[PDB]
Scaffold this active site. Structure first.
Site, PDB file in Angstrom:
ATOM      1  N   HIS C 185       0.857  -1.194   0.000  1.00 24.90           N
ATOM      2  CA  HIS C 185       0.000   0.000   0.000  1.00 24.90           C
ATOM      3  C   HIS C 185       0.889   1.239   0.000  1.00 24.90           C
ATOM      4  O   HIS C 185       0.420   2.319   0.349  1.00 24.90           O
ATOM      5  CB  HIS C 185      -0.916   0.087   1.236  1.00 24.90           C
ATOM      6  CG  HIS C 185      -1.708  -1.153   1.503  1.00 24.90           C
ATOM      7  ND1 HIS C 185      -3.048  -1.277   1.194  1.00 24.90           N
ATOM      8  CD2 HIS C 185      -1.350  -2.318   2.086  1.00 24.90           C
ATOM      9  CE1 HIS C 185      -3.478  -2.467   1.576  1.00 24.90           C
ATOM     10  NE2 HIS C 185      -2.463  -3.118   2.119  1.00 24.90           N
ATOM     11  N   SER C 315      23.227  18.295 -16.377  1.00 22.72           N
ATOM     12  CA  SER C 315      23.662  19.649 -16.045  1.00 22.72           C
ATOM     13  C   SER C 315      24.785  19.595 -15.017  1.00 22.72           C
ATOM     14  O   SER C 315      24.696  18.868 -14.028  1.00 22.72           O
ATOM     15  CB  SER C 315      22.498  20.455 -15.456  1.00 22.72           C
ATOM     16  OG  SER C 315      21.327  20.354 -16.249  1.00 22.72           O
ATOM     17  N   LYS C 321      20.870  14.103 -10.507  1.00 24.52           N
ATOM     18  CA  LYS C 321      19.563  13.959 -11.141  1.00 24.52           C
ATOM     19  C   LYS C 321      19.726  13.032 -12.345  1.00 24.52           C
ATOM     20  O   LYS C 321      20.256  13.434 -13.380  1.00 24.52           O
ATOM     21  CB  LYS C 321      18.982  15.318 -11.562  1.00 24.52           C
ATOM     22  CG  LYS C 321      17.651  15.237 -12.340  1.00 24.52           C
ATOM     23  CD  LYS C 321      16.736  16.408 -11.979  1.00 24.52           C
ATOM     24  CE  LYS C 321      15.481  16.543 -12.866  1.00 24.52           C
ATOM     25  NZ  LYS C 321      14.541  15.372 -12.924  1.00 24.52           N
ATOM     26  N   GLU C 328      10.994   4.997 -18.707  1.00 26.63           N
ATOM     27  CA  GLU C 328       9.948   5.808 -19.315  1.00 26.63           C
ATOM     28  C   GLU C 328       9.618   5.302 -20.715  1.00 26.63           C
ATOM     29  O   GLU C 328       8.453   5.279 -21.112  1.00 26.63           O
ATOM     30  CB  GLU C 328      10.361   7.275 -19.334  1.00 26.63           C
ATOM     31  CG  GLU C 328      10.565   7.823 -17.932  1.00 26.63           C
ATOM     32  CD  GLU C 328      11.070   9.241 -17.904  1.00 26.63           C
ATOM     33  OE1 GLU C 328      11.347   9.819 -18.975  1.00 26.63           O
ATOM     34  OE2 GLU C 328      11.192   9.787 -16.794  1.00 26.63           O
TER      35      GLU C 328
END
Lengths: 455, 455, 456, 456
Positions: C185, C315, C321, C328
């Site tokens: 959950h 970057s 990141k 995806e």
């Protein structure tokens, strides 16, 4: 009954109608999840009861539950299986995604009832406890998936398959019966080369036979049970023999080939077996849709359609016989198609250790099985067994078509045959009328040469 | 009751339970369409009653039905609307595709009951007749589509829209309340540039506001009624003013903007208005799915997730609060998605003058409306109104991220800022620890320069 | 241009092309969107023509001269020498007649040249009389569909699936000892090892493989020999068996003649069923991809239990990141397969009488799904899965941060007492040990010895 | 080759190409299937860059020299001069970052040349610093998606829909006096005119048009200016409004800046809703196409009430067999739109937090649907609908062959008596008149005067 009984849980005390066997948690859920009207299917309720019955027996065998308490739970479960407590499960499908609330609903009902069976009373001074006794060695996480598979396998084996075989038998009989009846073929909805009605029906038979095998191939995955995996699949807080013994117990009492799932993580984190099994059902739905459509189109009329066959008129415009059985069947085939999408979305949405889209998945799955099984049964007894050919109409269509010109080729050559076809078509004549007008052959010759039986 | 009553139709006599108000045709259907468990929704039953009530009034006004007989039918219909005869409609959804059987079910119940109201008796010696009186100026073909639209429009206007506006209001309040709370943004599930919690919630608000307008745009087509088109849409066997008058009557008694369909052929041959209306509902389902997911992910924890917000704990692992309301909502969103496919298939399958996939289409449509309306109501009162931010957790996340390095640029330049970011990342330090280790600035300066409020 | 003709008359075709009048006419009548027949289907159609030519020759229906030339032209298509010769859109006649004629004309024109002839109306090999001998668009297209489908599943899909499975199996084995916090959950739950969690993904893929294998026998059935309506009218009795054998031989796949040609022509049942297994695989892959990206979320404000390779440049001022791009791409194609299933189902349920005429659309969606799944698994495997690594410090930090471990204490102290420290830790924001020691219910030593996470 | 580089290092790119390092790297990491960005989207992305360049120039953020060169390179893309410069697959990063960089690199490299510079690392215009100024992949891709979608709906779909409607409206008007037999449940029912039946198709299309128009306002909202997460950080306050205005100007479409950028970035709601209208249109078209092909079924053993043009050549020995090919192409693409809707719905329901990353897939399906519907209506219109003609003899034969007309007799004779002749006609296989006369219930004259089918 207005009179209430005060029950309680970790969150506090809540009023439960005195004439009901559920407890505090079921009452809380009932009040928090007032969404629509769909409740757990009776088949799922019975599967849950069977699961609890099996767990009780094994818990007893392992010395985890007293004989008396275990036998009481077992007896209470049997009453549920007998249909004596269908009114004790008010929870909606739209609840917690793991089915925890319905698990607790079963635990509370069985606890309160088993207490009475032991000379006790229902309520907070009960002899049997929902969690400690009825839910012993279990978790909502592995119980619900197990109940899902038990219900699914039995429904497929006991309802769906038998009905499929029956319809297949009926169609096969019709196929043999009309083996000699030559009719016009239709491709792209246009008149095409001839074939017998028996051959056309044999196609429906082969479709159903192939569908049967596809459905059979999906069964072994559904037979895998998650019981024993507990909260996350590791089997924490269980006896090492539990998973195997409980699967054996269920197999014995249902006479179905159930086995413990080789990988409990796959079993708890997904609904893969059902996503795949339903894949075979949407396949059957597509096949049934085509058969039903062929039947109603072939029976269309009585004067301005195809009218090659006639079907039983089951209800009270003279010859206007609406193919209602075909309409019910085509409608439910669309339903199965929609159900597949809901199931696919739910199945692809698992996260980490548990898929929490279960009530929705089982709601759609069992519905498709009911629809398909009952649909085939109804279509069979109210339509298929009575399919009859309209020989006069069939022959009329054959004789009015331009498709039989091919039989002339070996006798008068392609060029003359094509000329006759062209003339008939342009002038709106039959092949015979055109052939005779041109003087290419006599009527006796036409009648001897163009024998549709040699298609 | 074991005692039977002999009723009859064009096909013959059949036994009907004596305590029931239906007749011969309903009994025949009941025995021929034993498919699954889905029956006509109560809302559809009431819409059918409203339609019959309206037809009776107009038939009276046109001098086609006697005042006494017409008023009796009207009175009987009102009892149905009052919920006094919910047990009189046993027919399954899986019947004739035009809904003829349920139309007849309403005709028989209203006839037998109106007879009693006129001092008569139920059965074959009834004063009011199912077809001649209750179905006067009508056809199953235009009655069922009308009942479909009446039920659909009222459900959208009275259930769905009010709940949508309410949830929107609650979220808007939360948006304003948390306008100053800066949190870390997340793109691709990765830490990203900051935004306030209020801005994030404003996105959910804008989604709901846009969904409202989309739903509103679908209403006018649903408001079009087929009543008056009769069998094929030509309006054969009706008074020229009928179609208009019956639409006005329904509008008056429901206070909804109903109008007669400008083209009766489009109205009878398709379910286009509902296919389009449902398109807006699957849109809302996709939006609700995202909002529900954001809520549960943001509330995940309490220790090993995101934990930025806390939601009301509605049922009885200490801080383990399962987002059950979110689970019910996401499950029903998948259901709406599946329902859209069933509806699309049914809607694209019309043939010539009539679409015969209606019961299935209305079953799925009204279910989606119930699910969406009740789902939003439950989610609102049991989750949304109590959403609270975990300020300590939010701030902790902000201070541990590398995303605030941007505030240093205007002070120490990009190159030094990037160096600090790189060091912190490689060494597992906070931006401040890395900046201080390098000696590029003092703690006072850091604290003064990196103010997330100026994001 | 060159002037080619058919029963409807003459029409100009670009001189540098090998197609004929019918293809040129179709090019003008079906100008819909941009989807054309995929290469795999073109090759399958070429193989079907090659097999028919051989059998016709063996039965003495076609001269050795023409038969060998046709097979030679077909091999050139297979070799990628004529990709530019099939311009027809997917959105044509539902039987695929246009594409059948496209192949007949290209093969006839090229075969003529091979025989010292020319392309065009003075050609030595005839598209209908020779290349289409003993066939019909009705039974040729379904055959091409099954050949393409079975070869794609066997040569592309299955191998990629096995490879991805093997990689994940290695990972589960490698991380078999790393205890992490379970989640149900989305909430903290009891522990399990990273290896166990990954073993779940492995079992899913292994199950999918068998489901896919179960659908192959039906797809192996060929319609060739059924002719126009399934009766086999105008064909030598041994034709159907011989051509199926020939196809099995040249492709090395177990093709067989369909037992019931009526079922073979009137439906796309084999593909509806086979695709059912594919959407099942898509649902499984979607779940796996989602677990990976959520487990790698971060680097500071998500879960961050694992790290995956950074494939795209980032970057300078934003180190850490790492967007889970392969995940995806994989989840997006999984959604595509689900949509594809609906289109196939509608087409499959729509056959009428002797022939289903939704074929081009069905095969377009089916082949795309196989392509998406095969390539998607390959890309995910090489650019993500092979590089999955655990962030041990993060994993342990989370494990020792949850209140879930309080269960171990029960066996050493009353349920209520063990729960008591949990209540405090939770309420004060302390760790189980910090609360345990502060409550004086135990000492550091005995706590550590009691709460053994590795002991489940 | 040429050597280009990025933060990850250098990589060789084909010298004859204008793309850079990031596009080259993506070409190696996302080798999935064969679907690439469609031309309409490439153009939309080019327009977005052109508008950004102009506004940046106006705000003094970009030099006139570079700004004009970038716009010039963009116009070349719009002119179809660089179609070969966008090799990236649809199955890439869910934000469409790859394709954004593909456009930035191509525009930068070409703009450099335009400024007397060279392509490659010594280029004068920089992909990130110049072409991507004031933007982010996060807000640029959604903007490109909406520009492409709105222009496709307005320039292609709507005009084709109106044209098809006008054609069918002419047909209903032309056949307003032809009485035919109605059919419900596929059974003979009461009469109606062919014109009335066709008017039903017309009304369906008119309704669909308004439904489609209702979805345009939401699609007109642009994300540009929302930047990374929707806050607009690192952008001049007037940027969002100005760029939306610029886009409206150059496209002549009513684009506006999205009122809520968070909703704009985190969802694909506008497209999920707009596609809802499209699948509705597909359901309508499917019904229309089916009526046409069933009404034209024959020529001898079907319904055959109408005739449609024969577009493909037919067999000499089989005159009359006219396959309704345009109807088959249309119904197939309608099934495709339905499948496309499911894929879009799953992607649309899958956004997380600040950004929905299922974009490339959503736009691929959406644009395909528009393309299929627009072209499909055009083809059906020109190659089928304009040529629909009634077979008056067949229509009348069927009309006078049904027992449905017995209703007219009731008004002139007791229900039971009128029904009596119907019973006989039906039982003996005679016509209503034949049975009527044989039963002596009336004479030829009075029968003909009573049963007036044109009087409904």
């Amino acid at each position: 009954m207005n009179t209430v009984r005060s029950e309680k849980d970790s969150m506090g005390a809540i009023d439960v109608p005195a004439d009901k066997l559920w407890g505090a948690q079921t009452q809380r859920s009932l009040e928090h999840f007032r969404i629509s009207t769909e409740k757990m299917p009776t088949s799922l309720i019975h599967a849950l009861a069977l699961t609890k019955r099996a767990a009780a027996k094994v818990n007893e065998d392992l010395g985890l539950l007293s004989e008396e308490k275990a036998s009481a739970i077992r007896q209470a479960a049997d009453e549920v299986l007998a249909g004596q407590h269908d009114d004790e499960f008010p929870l909606a499908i739209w609840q917690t995604g793991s089915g925890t609330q319905s698990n607790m609903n079963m635990n509370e009902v069985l606890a309160n009832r088993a207490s009475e069976l032991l000379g006790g009373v229902r309520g907070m001074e009960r002899k049997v406890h929902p969690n400690d006794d009825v839910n012993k060695s279990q978790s909502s996480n592995d119980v619900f998936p197990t109940a899902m598979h038990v219900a699914a396998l039995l429904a497929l084996r006991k309802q769906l398959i038998p009905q499929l075989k029956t319809l297949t038998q009926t169609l096969n009989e019709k196929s043999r019966a009309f083996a000699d009846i030559v009719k016009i073929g239709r491709t792209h909805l246009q008149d095409a080369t001839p074939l017998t009605l028996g051959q056309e029906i044999s196609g429906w038979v082969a479709m159903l036979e192939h569908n049967l095998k596809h459905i059979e191939y999906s069964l072994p995955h559904v037979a895998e049970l998650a019981l024993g995996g507990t909260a996350v699949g590791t089997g924490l807080n269980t006896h090492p023999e539990y998973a195997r013994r409980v699967a054996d117990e269920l197999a014995v009492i249902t006479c179905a080939p159930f086995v413990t799932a080789p990988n409990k993580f796959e079993a708890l984190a997904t609904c893969d077996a059902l996503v795949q099994a339903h894949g075979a059902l949407k396949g059957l739905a597509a096949s049934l849709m085509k058969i039903a459509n062929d039947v109603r189109w072939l029976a269309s009329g009585p004067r301005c359609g195809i009218g090659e066959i006639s079907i039983p008129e089951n209800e009270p415009m003279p010859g206007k016989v609406n193919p209602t059985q075909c309409e019910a069947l085509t409608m439910l085939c669309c339903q199965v198609m929609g159900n597949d999408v809901a199931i696919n979305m739910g199945g692809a949405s698992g996260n980490f250790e548990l898929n929490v889209f279960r009530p929705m998945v089982i709601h759609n799955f069992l519905q498709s099985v009911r629809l398909l099984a009952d649909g085939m049964e109804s279509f069979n007894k109210h339509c298929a067994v009575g399919i009859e050919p309209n020989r006069e109409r069939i022959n009329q269509l054959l004789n009015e078509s331009l498709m039989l010109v091919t039989a002339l080729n070996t006798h008068i050559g392609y060029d003359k045959a094509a000329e006759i076809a062209k003339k008939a078509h342009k002038e709106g004549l039959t092949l015979k009328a055109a052939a005779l007008a041109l003087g290419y052959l006599s009527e006796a010759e036409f009648d001897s040469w163009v024998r549709p039986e040699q298609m």
